Design a protein around this ligand. Structure first.
Ligand SMILES: NC(=O)C1=CN([C@@H]2O[C@H](COP(=O)(O)OP(=O)(O)OC[C@H]3O[C@@H](n4cnc5c(N)ncnc54)[C@H](OP(=O)(O)O)[C@@H]3O)[C@@H](O)[C@H]2O)C=CC1
Ligand SMILES: Cc1cc2nc3c(=O)[nH]c(=O)nc-3n(C[C@H](O)[C@H](O)[C@H](O)COP(=O)(O)O)c2cc1C
Ligand SMILES: Cc1cc2nc3c(=O)[nH]c(=O)nc-3n(C[C@H](O)[C@H](O)[C@H](O)COP(=O)(O)O)c2cc1C
Lengths: 223, 222
């Protein structure tokens, strides 16, 4: 395996997977993956990430607690929304993603109950046997959050290298107090959760193909 | 196999602080930046705007940064206040600094040497190219997280083609200077990434920065 070919395979191969088989990732493989992810760089080598990996009965209790919190409207998000977050082309991209996702699920925007069933399953980690909750310092701002993203991508690519599918989910961070209470975590903010395991390649949702903007839209070269 | 190749990329990438003058071939640069675009993001928003600078334009930019620093014209879009890092995070920062400054041969009391080192850092460590990572005006934690996803995708794509890199928060302390030299408006500068081919004869490139143990950053429960 040539390095240039390997990076293309990992980077393009990793996709947000929304339906998993129940089979667990072997403990030795999970150890190798999370050890490798720790090699992510960060400002001054601060490594601000605190990662809680949940499996088995603890993962089942956590899924049920999230479903209950969602039903009781107990939203406890650590990161507030900022006005005008997605305007212009950012809004166009979100709308296009939403349309492709709902078309792959076979759901129309007006089918409120079907959107509910789908979102209940999202809180059950899309059936994934494992979830990694990415906690960050209480004073996390843009620079620290950037490092949390560097880590998240290092982890997802290390998972892809071992045939482990993943879904990064901001949704899980909307019930941060529930995650903290279940896991006994104190004085840390929850940025996202990453559901992981082995993809169910028969699920239509895993056939969704999300495009990218391309060089003309993202990059400029000057000399 | 793929598992070994991922280990080689993730562990092989290091912050390189001395470069050869040789340029990255244009076709390789286009392939690397197109591959980096495959980074995921919230709702596929892809909030990144990247300015890649080379040749005479890179020289003019480096000299403008050197001048801004010498004149104390610091302009920051994202604050970096002292005390941002506490407890173990502060000790990891101090431990890194002790390792870096020992490799550079610069003591804590050497103001003239620290100034000379910072001048070279604003000259992108002699790298033939620099990528300036611009983010939306209203960037907060979630959007910044996506910028980080992109930055790591880009650095690993570079490593795969034997391209060395150094992410630099330092360059974001002269945001108005970078904006003016590049004709950029209404975007915030998060960081710069200097890149090219490592000068393997430089002592600074021999530094190996460790990581906290898996037991220190990760907790498994069932
Ligand atoms: N307002 C501004 O202009 C700011 C600029 N920056 C820049 O952004 C980058 C990031 O800064 P930072 O993350 O602090 O990294 P720095 O390299 O500045 O400092 C990293 C660590 O090394 C220590 N250190 C500094 N000099 C020595 C030495 N000779 N021997 C041993 N240890 C040493 C620092 O202590 P100490 O606490 O004494 O610095 C700190 O613990 C740098 O280029 C910095 O100059 C960062 C923040 C604010
Ligand atoms: C930080 C972050 C948070 C995300 N949050 C969610 C989420 O809550 N639910 C979800 O279904 N997908 C979520 N996504 C996944 C995407 O929507 C996806 O990465 C994007 O559409 C690009 O598609 P791809 O990853 O399949 O290439 C998130 C992605 C990231 C990077
Ligand atoms: C977002 C970010 C900003 C950084 N800023 C600087 C910088 O301004 N100057 C510098 O010499 N190194 C900078 N670093 C590089 C590191 O300090 C380095 O990644 C860390 O010490 C781990 O070492 P390694 O990348 O060689 O494995 C930065 C790293 C990141 C991820």
């Amino acid at each position: 395996v040539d390095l240039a070919q390997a990076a293309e395979r990992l980077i393009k191969g990793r996709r947000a997977v929304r339906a998993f088989r129940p089979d667990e990732v072997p403990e030795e493989t999970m150890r190798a993956v999370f050890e490798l992810a720790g090699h992510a760089p960060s400002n001054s080598n601060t490594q601000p990430w605190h990662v809680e990996v949940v499996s088995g009965a603890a993962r089942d209790r956590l899924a049920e607690a999230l479903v209950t919190a969602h039903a009781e409207e107990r939203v406890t998000v650590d990161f507030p929304y900022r006005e005008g977050l997605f305007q212009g082309v950012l809004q166009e991209r979100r709308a296009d993603f939403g349309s492709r996702l709902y078309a792959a699920l076979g759901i129309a925007r007006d089918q409120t109950d079907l959107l509910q069933g789908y979102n209940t399953e999202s809180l059950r980690f899309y059936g994934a046997p494992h979830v990694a909750m990415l906690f960050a310092p209480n004073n996390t701002e843009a620079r620290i959050a950037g490092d949390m993203g560097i880590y998240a991508q290092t982890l997802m690519l290390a998972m892809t290298a071992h045939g482990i599918a993943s879904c990064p989910q901001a949704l899980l961070s909307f019930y941060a107090d529930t995650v903290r209470a279940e896991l006994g975590v104190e004085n840390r903010k929850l940025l996202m959760g990453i559901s992981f395991g082995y993809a169910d390649d028969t699920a239509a949702v895993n056939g969704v193909r999300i495009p990218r903007a391309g060089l003309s839209e993202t990059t400029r070269f000057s000399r």
